[PDB]
Amino acid sequence: GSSGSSGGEELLPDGVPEEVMESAQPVANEEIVAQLVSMGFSQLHCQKAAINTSNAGVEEAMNWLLSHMDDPDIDAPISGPSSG
């Protein structure tokens, strides 16, 4: 028997191969953020959190924060020079 499997592509594509992305993203609710930013959190994060939770609820947003408090992304900007 034989499997055979090995190849190299190298370099990354520009955006996404086939099927382009569309406009459909959450927004750091001003209410959920204004609430978090009040609770004693970082707006930036308060934003991400909510967003991360589609601003499902202040609790959700925070919960995320409590799970994204000690993260590098928490520092990363929401809208910047994307790259990955």
UniProtKB/Swiss-Prot annotation:
Tissue expression pattern: Constitutively and ubiquitously expressed (at protein level).
Boundaries of every UBA domain copy: 27-68
Known role: Recognizes and hydrolyzes the peptide bond at the C-terminal Gly of ubiquitin. Involved in the processing of poly-ubiquitin precursors as well as that of ubiquitinated proteins. Involved in seed and embryo development.
Family: Belongs to the peptidase C19 family.
Name of the protein described by the UniProt record: Ubiquitin carboxyl-terminal hydrolase 14
Section covered of the full-length record: 594 to 664 of 797
